Design a protein around this motif. Structure first.
Motif, PDB file in Angstrom:
ATOM      1  N   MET A 172     -39.376  -4.304   1.182  1.00 16.63           N
ATOM      2  CA  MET A 172     -40.876  -4.139   0.411  1.00 16.63           C
ATOM      3  C   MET A 172     -41.865  -3.551   1.359  1.00 16.63           C
ATOM      4  O   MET A 172     -41.859  -4.153   2.524  1.00 16.63           O
ATOM      5  CB  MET A 172     -41.333  -5.576  -0.033  1.00 16.63           C
ATOM      6  CG  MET A 172     -42.813  -5.688  -0.835  1.00 16.63           C
ATOM      7  SD  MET A 172     -43.791  -7.262  -0.334  1.00 16.63           S
ATOM      8  CE  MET A 172     -43.681  -7.021   1.585  1.00 16.63           C
ATOM      9  N   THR A 173     -42.729  -2.876   0.787  1.00 16.21           N
ATOM     10  CA  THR A 173     -43.968  -2.368   1.338  1.00 16.21           C
ATOM     11  C   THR A 173     -45.003  -2.883   0.618  1.00 16.21           C
ATOM     12  O   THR A 173     -45.003  -2.564  -0.776  1.00 16.21           O
ATOM     13  CB  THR A 173     -44.127  -0.985   1.826  1.00 16.21           C
ATOM     14  OG1 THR A 173     -43.415  -0.528   2.680  1.00 16.21           O
ATOM     15  CG2 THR A 173     -45.329  -0.395   2.196  1.00 16.21           C
ATOM     16  N   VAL A 239     -50.794  -3.183  -4.104  1.00 19.14           N
ATOM     17  CA  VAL A 239     -49.649  -2.954  -4.897  1.00 19.14           C
ATOM     18  C   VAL A 239     -48.321  -2.995  -4.081  1.00 19.14           C
ATOM     19  O   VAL A 239     -48.320  -2.642  -2.883  1.00 19.14           O
ATOM     20  CB  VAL A 239     -49.639  -1.189  -5.082  1.00 19.14           C
ATOM     21  CG1 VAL A 239     -49.587  -0.483  -4.016  1.00 19.14           C
ATOM     22  CG2 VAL A 239     -48.380  -0.971  -6.316  1.00 19.14           C
ATOM     23  N   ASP A 241     -44.325  -2.201  -3.322  1.00 19.66           N
ATOM     24  CA  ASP A 241     -43.465  -1.142  -3.475  1.00 19.66           C
ATOM     25  C   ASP A 241     -42.129  -1.626  -2.919  1.00 19.66           C
ATOM     26  O   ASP A 241     -41.868  -1.691  -1.754  1.00 19.66           O
ATOM     27  CB  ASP A 241     -44.022  -0.074  -2.514  1.00 19.66           C
ATOM     28  CG  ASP A 241     -42.965   1.193  -2.227  1.00 19.66           C
ATOM     29  OD1 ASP A 241     -42.113   1.019  -2.750  1.00 19.66           O
ATOM     30  OD2 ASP A 241     -43.526   2.174  -1.675  1.00 19.66           O
ATOM     31  N   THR A 243     -37.834  -1.625  -2.645  1.00 18.55           N
ATOM     32  CA  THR A 243     -36.899  -0.767  -2.728  1.00 18.55           C
ATOM     33  C   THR A 243     -35.752  -1.773  -2.807  1.00 18.55           C
ATOM     34  O   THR A 243     -35.588  -2.452  -1.935  1.00 18.55           O
ATOM     35  CB  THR A 243     -36.866   0.007  -1.423  1.00 18.55           C
ATOM     36  OG1 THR A 243     -38.249   0.946  -1.264  1.00 18.55           O
ATOM     37  CG2 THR A 243     -35.780   1.017  -1.539  1.00 18.55           C
ATOM     38  N   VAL A 308     -42.660  -0.640  -8.599  1.00 22.80           N
ATOM     39  CA  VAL A 308     -43.904  -0.614  -8.339  1.00 22.80           C
ATOM     40  C   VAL A 308     -44.838  -1.825  -9.233  1.00 22.80           C
ATOM     41  O   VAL A 308     -44.775  -1.514 -10.274  1.00 22.80           O
ATOM     42  CB  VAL A 308     -44.650   0.738  -8.405  1.00 22.80           C
ATOM     43  CG1 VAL A 308     -46.315   0.769  -8.216  1.00 22.80           C
ATOM     44  CG2 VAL A 308     -43.971   1.735  -7.659  1.00 22.80           C
TER      45      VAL A 308
END
Ligand SMILES: OC[C@H]1O[C@H](O[C@H]2O[C@H](CO)[C@@H](O)[C@H](O)[C@H]2O)[C@H](O)[C@@H](O)[C@@H]1O
Ligand SMILES: OC[C@H]1O[C@H](O[C@H]2O[C@H](CO)[C@@H](O)[C@H](O)[C@H]2O)[C@H](O)[C@@H](O)[C@@H]1O
Ligand SMILES: OC[C@H]1O[C@H](O[C@H]2O[C@H](CO)[C@@H](O)[C@H](O)[C@H]2O)[C@H](O)[C@@H](O)[C@@H]1O
Ligand SMILES: OC[C@H]1O[C@H](O[C@H]2O[C@H](CO)[C@@H](O)[C@H](O)[C@H]2O)[C@H](O)[C@@H](O)[C@@H]1O
Ligand SMILES: O=P(O)(O)OC[C@H](O)CO
Ligand SMILES: O=P(O)(O)OC[C@H](O)CO
Ligand code: NA
Ligand code: NA
Ligand code: NA
Ligand code: NA
Lengths: 330, 330, 330, 330
Positions: A172-173, A239, A241, A243, A308
Motif C-alpha cells: 500500500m501507498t 488516498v 493506492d 497493489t 484506489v
C-alpha cells in the motif's frame, strides 16, 4: 443518549465534536484541553477546511454553550482529576495522542468515565476496531482504539478484495494530506527528519504501520500487507493506492462489481463506490471511511491490480470514532 | 561543437537551454517560438522554480545575445520554413509537443537540420531512447525521441531490478508535480475531466502510458509493467513508486547493493542512490533521471517489494535530451 | 419568477447557477457554452472550492435535469442564434467575458431576451451598478454591468467612509486569490508577463482598474482613488486594503461604529462587519460583497487610516449578479 | 577574521551560517542548539527553500566539520555555560528568539563572548540598527539588535523617500511569506489566534510593529509610519506596500530616479532597484534588504503614492546580521 467527554480539542476532537452535533444517539457534555473557553469557541466556530460551525456558540462563566447546551470546559493535564462522573460521562473520546496505553487511558475510568475510545492506534495491546472489519469482535472491553485513518480506509477494501478473490500479498501507498505534526517551513522534527521539512513545498515520504495493522483487525490478512506514505501539500483528504496479487483471477469489471455490491450492502456507510471523475476535494466532508475510485485503478492482469480508495482523514475517521462509541455502548 | 536549434521555448525548451550553457560539446545557436525576443529574454532570465539565469541576456535587433553569443530568434509556425541551415544547426531539439511523428518532425530536415530529437514520446514508431536503458541500441536514425520524464525515471531502475532479480510483473504510481497542462482553479479540460480541477487544491488521479512505454526501450519488460499517476500541488520534482514481484529472491539489502553498484558504475550520472532523509525539493535541479531512495522503499518479502525513485521532471529529462543529442552526434 | 439564461459556464456562471437555486424569485432555465451536457453536469456536481452540488443533476436527451427541472443546454458561438425566446428567458447572465459592449451583448435581445446583465465591467459606456453604491440610480436600461468583484468590495466601504468622513484621496491594494487567467507553472502570458508566472509559487503584482472604477458608480469619488493588486496562492477569497486620508477627523472607534451601523442597517446583506479573528477561508461562501475586518485595520491618526475588507470573489459577486437581475426586473 | 558563535540553528541561524561561508571576514566557529550534531548536519545539508548546501558536511565525535573546518556543537539552554571564550568567539549571533533583552543576552558575554547581535527586534531598550539607515549611529555598545526583516526593508526606502520629498505620513502593509511560527493546519496559537489557522489555506492578517519601529532607526520618522501584515501561502520572500503622503510634489519618474540614484550610490547592496516584470520568487536568495519595484507602484497624484519593495525575509536579513557583526567589530 450516550454522554461523551472529549479529551483533546485538536483536529480530531473538534471534528468529532461537530459530527456529534448531527447524531441524536451521542451528546458531548464536556471538553478538556489546555485552552481557554473563549479560544475553544473560536476554534470551533471557524474552520479553514470545513467552514463555519453550523450552530450557535457562547462562552459563559468559563464554559461553552453550544446550540443552547452547556458544555463543561476543563484544563486538567492529569486525566485522573477530570471528574467525568460529575457530568455523567459514559465514554471518553481520548484524542490528545498522549494516552495510547491501557495505563494512561485508564485514568479516565478512575476519574468516573465507564469507557474510553482512543482516537489513534494503541501503543500497547489495547484492542483496535475498524468499522466494516471487526466491530463484531468487540467483547465488552472498557478501553478500545479506533485504529488510524489510513487503516480505516484500507481494511474495509482489503476485506472485500480478500473475501472475494484471496489476497496473496499486497503493498500500500497512501498519498496523504498534510497534518498537524508537520512544519510550515523546514523545522525541527528530531524523531522524523523528513517530517520537519516544509509541508507546502514537498512530497514527503513517511513510514506508516497502517497497512501492517490491517492484520490486527483482519487476522486472516496478518503478514500479507504493508506499505508507506507520501505526505503532500493538501490540507485534507488522502488516498489509498493498493497493489495486490489475487489467488482467484478477477477481471477489473468483476472487482468493481464486488466492491459495489459491498458498498450497497454489508459495508453501506463505511465503503463507498464511485465511477465519477473525482479528485481529492470531492471527498472533503465525506463520512465513508473508504470510497473506491473505479476509474482510477488499473489491472496489469487478472491476478495483479492497483486499487484506489479515497478517505477524508479528518471527517471519516471522526465519524467512525462516534460509531465505535455507540457500538461499545450497545 | 554540436550546433542545436530549439523549437519551442516552454519549460523543456528553456531548461534545455540553461543546461546547454554548462556543456562544452553543445551550443544553442537558434530558438523558434511564437514569442517576441524581449519576452523570450524575460522567460529565460527569471524562473520561479530554478532561479535567475546564470549569465547575461540582452536583446539586439530582434535576436538574443546570451553570454555574448548571438542566438537567432524566429517565430515560424511551419518548421519547413525554419531555414536551420542558415545558422548551421546540426540537431533540432523539437520541444513544441506538436511534431511527434516522422512526417512532421522531418520538416526540420527539409529546413536544413541533420537530425531531430523529440522532447516527448513519439506518437508513431519513431524510436525512443532512454539513457540507462537503450542508448546503445541507437543505430544511426536521424529522428529519435527521448521518451518522457517518467519513462526516464522508471526505465533505468526497472533494468537494474530486472537484470539482477527478474521482474515477473510490476505496477507503478508516479506522484507527480503540477504541470503546465493543469488549471489554477476548476476549468475546462474536455479530454481529461480530472485534469481541469484546480491543481493547488487537489490530489488528481491521472492516466500515464510511461510504465507500458518501458517495453519500447526494454523489450524484455514488454507486457510486464503498467501504472498510473497522481498530480499533487508541488511545482516541480516527481517520484516513482514501483511495486514489483521478483523471480529471484532478494532481500532489501541485496536490492540496495545492486542499485548502488549501478549508480556508482555503469549507470553513473543517470541512476542515483541515496540513504538520506530526502524530500522532493532535495532534487530540484538534480540531473540524474532516477534517484533511488533507499530508506523510503519497503519489502513485504524477498519476492514482493516497493521501490522509490525521485526525478526532477524538468531538469533530469532536459539534461538527457542533451545527452541524446550528443549520443546521436558521435 | 424571473427566467434567466446563463451564457458562459465558467466560475461565475456556475456559482451564479448554484446561488439561483436558493432564490425563489429567479429560475435558471437555460445554459449556453461550448461544453457537452454531461461535462456541464460534472462541473456543476463537483467543485474544488465550494463542495458538492446541493441537489440532483442528470443528463437527459442532451439537456440537464437539475432538482427535477429541465435546463436547456446549447453550444452556440453567436449569441444572436441563442433563441432565448423559445425558453422564455427574461434576463441573460452574460458570463463569457466576450460580450462586454452594447453591440455584442444586445445580440441576446435580438435572440429574444428582454435584458442582459454583464458579469464583468463593461468595456464601453454600458452602465455599471454595484449594490450598496448605486443600484438606486438604475433607470430602466436593458443592458447593464455588475462591475467587478473588487469594485463590489471597495465601493460599499468607500461610500460609507466618504459619506461620513469625506475621502480626500485613497490608495487600494487587493490581496487577491489565484484566478483562471493564471498559470500553474511559468508559462506564456504575452499581454501580462507577471501573470504567466506560476501561481502557487508566487506573490504576483497585478494592475487593476477597480479603484478608479468606483468613480463610475460613485461619481463623487471620481479621481480620488486608485490602486493595485497582488495575486497570491489561495484558490478563493480576496481582501481590500484601503488607505485613505479623511476630511473630517474620525477615531478608529468612530469609523467602526459608522461601518457597523451601515452593515446592520441600509447596507445589510451587502456590507458586513466583524470583530472576530478571521482569516480568508472564513469567507469562503460568504454572500456579503464587503466584510469590514475591525481588528485588522489600523489608524495612524484621526485623518489617515488603513481599512480592511474581505470578499469571496466568486460567491459575493455571483449573488449580486442575481440581485441586479432582480433589481432591473422590478 | 571575526569569530562568530551562533545560538539557535533555526531558519535564521542556518541561513546566517550559509551566508557566512561566502564571506572572508567572518568565521562561524560554534553552534549551540538542542539538536544532535547529525541532525544539525542534515538541516544544513538540505534546504527546501535554498537548495543543497554548497560544500562538505561531516559529523565527527559530536561536532561538525564543514568545508574542512571544525565547528563546536553544544546543547546548553543556559547561555552562561557556553564557554564561548574556549572557541575564541568574538560575537554571538543570538538567534533563538528567546534572549531579546539585555539581561538574557548578556549571558553570552558572561560566557566569554565580547559582543552579541540579536537576530530580532529587542524587547527592551537594546539599540536596533538597520543597514542603510543608522549603522553610523553605533556607539560601541556590546549588545545590539538587527531589528526585523520587515523594518530592514521599509527603513532604507523610507529614508530615501523622506530625504528627497518629505514623508508627511505613511501606512505600510507587508504581504509576507509563511514562517515557522505558523501552523500547517488549524492549530493552537493562543497568543495569536489568526496565526494558528492553516498557513497554506489562508491569507492571514497579522499585527506588526515593524513600520512603527522605523522611527527607532530613523528618528525623524518617529510617529509618521505604522502598518500591518498579511501572511500568505508562499515559503519565502515578502513585499512592502508603502502608501505615503509627500511634502514636496514628485512625479513617479522623479521618485524612481531618486530611488535608483540611492541604489547605485550610498545604499548600494542594501537598496536595490528594478524595472523588470518580477514576482516574489525572483528574489529568493536576494541579499539586498529592499528591492524597489518601479513598475509595480502607482501614484494617485504628485503627493500621494503607493511604493513596492521586495525582500527575501530569510536571506537579506541574515546577510545584514553578518553586516552588523562586521560593523560593530570595526
Ligand atoms: O531520531 C534520529 C533518527 O532520525 C532519522 O530517523 C527518524 O526519522 C526518519 C524520517 O526522516 C524515520 O524514517 C525514522 O523512523 C526515524 O527514526 C534519521 O534517518 C536517523 O538516521 C536518525 O537516527
Ligand atoms: O472527453 C469525454 C470523456 O471525459 C471523461 O474522460 C476523459 O477524462 C478522464 C479524466 O477525467 C480520462 O481518464 C479519460 O481517458 C478521458 O477520456 C469522462 O470520464 C468520460 O465519461 C467522457 O466521455
Ligand atoms: O505585451 C508586451 C509588454 O509586456 C509587459 O507588459 C505587460 O505585462 C505587464 C505585467 O508583466 C503589465 O503591467 C503591462 O501592462 C503589460 O503591457 C512588459 O512589461 C512590456 O515591456 C512589454 O512591452
Ligand atoms: O491571547 C488572547 C487573545 O487572543 C486573540 O488576540 C491575540 O491574537 C490576535 C490575532 O488573532 C492578536 O491580534 C492579538 O494581539 C493577540 O492578543 C483574541 O483576539 C483576543 O480576544 C484574546 O484576548
Ligand atoms: O543502458 P544504455 O544502453 O543507455 O547505455 C548507457 C551506458 O552509459 C553506456 O555506457
Ligand atoms: O446604495 P444603493 O443605491 O445600491 O442602494 C441599495 C439599498 O439597499 C437600497 O435599499
Ligand atoms: Na448529538
Ligand atoms: Na554549451
Ligand atoms: Na431559484
Ligand atoms: Na567565512
Amino acid at each position: 443518549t450516550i454522554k461523551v467527554g472529549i479529551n483533546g480539542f485538536g483536529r480530531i476532537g473538534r471534528i468529532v465534536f461537530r459530527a456529534a452535533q448531527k447524531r441524536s444517539d451521542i451528546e458531548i457534555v464536556a471538553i478538556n484541553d489546555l485552552l481557554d473557553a473563549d479560544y475553544m469557541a473560536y476554534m470551533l466556530k471557524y474552520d479553514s477546511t470545513h467552514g463555519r460551525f453550523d450552530g450557535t456558540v457562547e462562552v459563559k462563566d468559563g464554559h461553552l454553550i453550544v446550540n443552547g447546551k452547556k458544555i463543561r470546559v476543563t484544563a486538567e493535564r492529569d486525566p485522573a482529576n477530570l471528574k467525568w462522573d460529575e457530568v455523567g460521562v459514559d465514554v471518553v473520546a481520548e484524542a490528545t495522542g498522549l494516552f495510547l496505553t491501557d495505563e494512561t487511558a485508564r485514568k479516565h475510568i478512575t476519574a468516573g468515565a465507564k469507557k474510553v475510545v482512543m482516537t489513534g492506534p494503541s501503543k500497547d495491546n489495547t484492542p483496535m476496531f475498524v468499522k466494516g472489519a471487526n466491530f463484531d469482535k468487540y467483547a465488552g472491553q472498557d478501553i478500545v482504539s479506533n485504529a488510524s485513518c489510513t487503516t480505516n480506509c484500507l481494511a474495509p477494501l482489503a476485506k472485500v478484495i480478500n473475501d472475494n478473490f484471496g489476497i496473496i500479498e499486497g503493498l500500500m501507498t497512501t498519498v496523504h494530506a498534510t497534518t498537524a505534526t508537520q512544519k510550515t517551513v523546514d523545522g525541527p522534527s528530531h524523531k522524523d527528519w523528513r517530517g520537519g521539512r516544509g509541508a507546502s513545498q514537498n512530497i514527503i515520504p513517511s513510514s506508516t504501520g497502517a497497512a501492517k495493522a490491517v492484520g490486527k483487525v483482519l487476522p486472516e490478512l496478518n503478514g500479507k500487507l504493508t506499505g508507506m506514505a507520501f505526505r503532500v501539500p493538501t490540507p485534507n483528504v488522502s488516498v489509498v493506492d493498493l497493489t495486490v496479487r489475487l489467488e482467484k483471477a478477477a477481471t477489473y469489471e468483476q472487482i468493481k462489481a464486488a466492491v459495489k455490491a459491498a458498498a450497497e450492502g454489508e459495508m453501506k456507510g463505511v465503503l463507498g463506490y464511485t465511477e465519477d471523475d473525482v479528485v481529492s476535494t470531492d471527498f472533503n466532508g465525506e463520512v465513508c471511511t473508504s470510497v473506491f475510485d473505479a476509474k482510477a485503478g488499473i489491472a496489469l492482469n487478472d491476478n495483479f491490480v492497483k486499487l484506489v480508495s479515497w478517505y477524508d482523514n479528518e471527517t471519516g475517521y471522526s465519524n467512525k470514532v462516534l460509531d465505535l462509541i455507540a457500538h461499545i455502548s450497545k
